[PDB]
Structure 1
Amino acid sequence: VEHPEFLKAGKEPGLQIWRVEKFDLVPVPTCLYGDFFTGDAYVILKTVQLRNGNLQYDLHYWLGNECSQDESGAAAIFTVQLDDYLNGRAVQHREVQGFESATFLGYFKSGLKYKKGGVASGF
């Protein structure tokens, strides 16, 4: 995958977030990290550096209550593709609005927020 966003992924410790927008993976502006459209699906990559300083990858796809099937489906498939791209080293996690893992909720230092709406289905 020559997907320009894949080239940018998992370089240094931290957090990257993309939104599924009409069958593509579009980066979220860093200033909007943590405000999730409940009508959308998102791909989140958490790069941690251990004490020996080896890279560690957790890959979360987050499904809004009102995301359409193409959006949730694309987020699943993009997750797999990104994982293959990262040589199988990312642990994959399905995160559903209202039921996120504590780990995922931990990523967001002022608490994640939900908001209605978003980008329309690509179907």
Structure 2
Amino acid sequence: EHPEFLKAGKEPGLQIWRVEKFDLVPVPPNLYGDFFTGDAYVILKTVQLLQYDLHYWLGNECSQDESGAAAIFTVQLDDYLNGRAVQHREVQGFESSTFSGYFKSGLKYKKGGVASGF
């Protein structure tokens, strides 16, 4: 459980969080599709038939605390959804077509990111 867990998967749509110093922080919706190469993200796609696909996205320059937190948060959100979510690891530049398909404008990357929690 967690404030952002409470919000997760309630309506069809796309929810994107960024790992920020060992926490799961919602990404400003105006930035959806633009991923900081130095950061890691958790993405929940909800479809109404509710089916859940969880993706964790790892930037090429993200730190071990961020990629590790992203993987753990993914497990924990899956558990919160009673394990019904399918988990997907997404590596910068090698993302699944499904993941790229979530973004009308395609995937784009930006230099930098939030600092490591280490």
Distance 1:81 1:7 in 2: 12
What is the deviation of 1:106? 0.1
Shift of 1:32: 0.6
Runs of 4+ deviating beyond 3 Å: none
CA distance in 2 between partners of 1:31 and 1:115 (Å): 14
Cα deviations by residue, 1:52-109 (Å, 9 ceiling, x for unpaired): xxx0000000000000000000000000000000000000000000100000000001
Deviation at 1:112, TM superposition (A): 1.5
Confirm whether residue 40 of structure 1 aligns to residue 35 of structure 2.
no
TM-score by length of 2: 0.99
For 1:15 and 1:109, the matched residues in 2 are separated by: 12
Distance 1:26 1:85 in 2: 17
Alpha-carbon distance in 2 for matches of 1:29, 1:9: 15
Unpaired runs of at least 5, structure 2: none
Percent identity over paired residues: 97
TM-score using structure 1 length: 0.95
Question: For this pair of structures, how many residues does the alignment match?
Answer: 118
C-alpha separation in 1, matches of 2:106 and 2:99? 10
Q: Measure how far apart 1:49 and its partner are.
A: 1.0
SS of 2:67's equivalent in the other structure is: helix
